[PDB]
Amino acid sequence: ELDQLRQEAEQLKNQIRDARKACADATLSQITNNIDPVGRIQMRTRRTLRGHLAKIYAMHWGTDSRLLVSASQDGKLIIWDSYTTNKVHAIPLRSSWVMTCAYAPSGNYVACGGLDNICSIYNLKTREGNVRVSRELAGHTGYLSCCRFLDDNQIVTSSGDTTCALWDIETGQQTTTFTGHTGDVMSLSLAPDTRLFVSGACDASAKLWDVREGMCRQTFTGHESDINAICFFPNGNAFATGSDDATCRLFDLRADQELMTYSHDNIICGITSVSFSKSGRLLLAGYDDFNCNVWDALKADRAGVLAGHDNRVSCLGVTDDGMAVATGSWDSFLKIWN
Amino acid sequence: TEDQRNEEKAQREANKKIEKQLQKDKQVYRATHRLLLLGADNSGKSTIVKQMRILSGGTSGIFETKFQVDKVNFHMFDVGGQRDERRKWIQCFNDVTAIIFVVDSSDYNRLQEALNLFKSIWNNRWLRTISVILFLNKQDLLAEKVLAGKSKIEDYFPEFARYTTPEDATPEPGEDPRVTRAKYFIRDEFLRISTASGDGRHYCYPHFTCAVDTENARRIFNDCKDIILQMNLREYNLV
Amino acid sequence: CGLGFVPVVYYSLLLCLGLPANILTVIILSQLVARRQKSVYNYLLALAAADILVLFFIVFVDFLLEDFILNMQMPQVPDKIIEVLEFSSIHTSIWITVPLTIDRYIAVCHPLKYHTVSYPARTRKVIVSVYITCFLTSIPYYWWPNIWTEDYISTSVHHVLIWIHCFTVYLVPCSIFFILNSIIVYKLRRKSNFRLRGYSTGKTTAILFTITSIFATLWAPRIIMILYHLYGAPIQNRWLVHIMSDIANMLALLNTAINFFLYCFISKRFRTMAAATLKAFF
Amino acid sequence: QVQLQESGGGLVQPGGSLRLSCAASGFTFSNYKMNWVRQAPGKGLEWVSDISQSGASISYTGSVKGRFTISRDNAKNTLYLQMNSLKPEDTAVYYCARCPAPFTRDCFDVTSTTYAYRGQGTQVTV
Amino acid sequence: TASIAQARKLVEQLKMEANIDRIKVSKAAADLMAYCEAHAKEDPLLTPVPASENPFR
Lengths: 338, 239, 282, 126, 57
Ligand SMILES: C[C@H](NC(=O)CNC(=O)c1cccc(Cl)c1)c1ccccc1
What we know:
heteropentamer, C: 9 helices, binds the ligand C[C@H](NC(=O)CNC(=O)c1cccc(Cl)c1)c1ccccc1, transmembrane (chain C)
């Protein structure tokens, strides 16, 4: 029966491959050759958020596109005011090895996780005003990789246990778990309708999940190595994945396959963080070679390089208005480009 | 703008407080040296952890081991709560001064696995600047094993019979040239991987430890002293 | 007059070879992000700034202009008051190298307890407390003899002034150079280091000893002659004192230029950064 | 998708010769340090040998050093492991594993839990 | 049985994932093009904003 199971799995894989091949009309490059190229894009460093002692893994812009949270391996969750270049808060964590941080859409709460297998939620606008550990979310067996507030009560959290979990901050319990992966899931990105997110794992596959149903709808494969960065196209019907094979892909949920490769020959370093502009034309990708890159999502032609970091860049976020992008890197500096 | 001015002064005061506390934390972060402890289950890394704990407290998966010797305190990190795949969370330990590797010196079956693990550590793109403090643990078990027969390390490693003990040996009075040859053969195996990459930017410091080896914190103390010394010499123009 | 012609061309070459070098040093270290991580970069930037101050002030407005361009200034307002700041510049150049050597001694002989007693706050304290102390304790350099003005008579203010100059530029700085450097060489060579360190002496201790050796050799003649005007040759030195006094001052100022090749040009990383950044404008 | 399918393998007398092949697919083959991993019956996963991108960093496991000779044909996306003189110890399930990061000389693929880039494997009965 | 059960879960997931209504790649790619060009103007990093409007300078 097991041999029959493998044979029928092969038949289903052949069926999905045939459907993908049939649905492939032409290349996105051919149909976007009627667009004029964007042109060279120069974004100077407006700020250099300089208050971190160790390397920085994650940053997350706020809803107001003014305040942001940055997590460094010293054990701090410094919340800055980008316009004023001021640190409105400096949250002392418990475990210094933090890998993620999330700023809630409302702004009342901030999350952080890491090697402790715990997603800690901090309330900011508390009665006194001193930041405290609001909740301690336990249940992940592997390390913690990416936290993202779905709202003030829930949070989607990826871990090193190949499982994602939709949490309930009010009670501290997993409402529904997303267990369909093979490798360690690193980055997750929520939809504009906050109903279908993706989980980018170390099995060269990103899977699309239902927040309410709790079961994967469509898997997305085609990468050559582990993906540790993922972000939806601003509508929610496409996303991009950055892996260690020095390429960024564009997967289309409607067509259920890859659209275009974003990779040059001279780049041989893995992408660490990806993010789109407010129109979805500037797919910024942070690479291990101490600098970022800017791509034209419709032509794959690289237009702009956000160099300026002395160590590996690890986090990358674009303001909800698209007026800035902050690239926190391992040199403990958050340079806000414009 | 007077209201805006006073509210922004209420922000610069918070910034000043945060700066003061961050300098105070800087006077604590650079005064401690984070250490990372790897190894396998059979390797008695927990015994060394307890021994240096006597010279602090943690039960949340990652067993921190705070210990000070000569008024300087290191911070060991016994991370073991994660899965068997470690190619992604090992990148957090890039700024660690030294990776502590405890190898089970009395296991011939699982010794090639330890060399493979060391080779992976010695060649990571994000670990290629971290010197390793090798710890060949419980040499007493190896001494008992070689001195009782059925210790054909020449079988599991075929290049033992065609091997001779190094001239730069340090034998204890009760030792046997045979157990000395074996225990330096493991060391030379690890240094063979050590002296094959990492062009003068990180070094493997090998040390022999038994089960009850009290002088373990001081050995790491001196090794870290040398590590910091070398990084300062390349940090200056001396090199 | 060749005796007075050689200094003019020598100082022209010194200016055109040292001002661009230290300006490039300031430009490179102003953008080098590691400065706020290590104190040696701050000390080096201070040394470059003091080199700018010295090589501008003493080598231009005292040695080119005042000596062989103008030869007209009234020696009341712009001569003695400007030597007040010129002596301050040279004293700062020496006492920026002093804390740099103390920092190196800490980082080498007590490497593990280094960030505890050396951080870019004590660095700021000692880097802004030497500028001020040199501009404040050089105010006494208002009585500088100008020995060849009109055959002046030596008074007691010049004696104490030159003793203070000695104690502040050579005798104490060389004393605290030699002891620290000898201790470093001792503890780095006569101690069992790593086995793969065959070239552990001629590349580290040789440099660390020649650094102070060249400073001592190039500042010995000026000190010994400013003491010679105190205790030697009342009636005989007048024949050929000016030429060799100028030579001693030339050696003293040549130290200020070799202080670049000994510190910034030595490191391969600095040279690679300079090579990368020299094409920034083009 | 990343698909490493193992061919060869079968009944072996104590001292037989087999051409273990790994028809890999789904990526540019000549960019990864391919390596072999065994699965001894009732025992954990162990490393067999590895070969670099070009074939200049070949390294064998200690036990079987002269018995096994690995060889990759980069233009055929394959990993050969010429296994002659097979002892009963080599009665394991061999696995053809690819290191995750392109252009690197190390990888953590001895993981008992399913490593993402590792084939289904063949059983060689000796 | 555990491996067989995992295989059954995998085949159920694959059957549910291959039975998804897909739309031609040309149409989806053109839709992404149309959305991106219909939102180009509000995007700041594409067409640079005036220095007065820019809050970071
Ligand atoms: C500022 C000072 N410049 C001077 O000190 C000028 N003083 C003399 O030339 C002099 C005075 C009395 C006796 C003798 Cl032997 C010489 C100076 C510092 C460093 C290098 C060169 C010059």
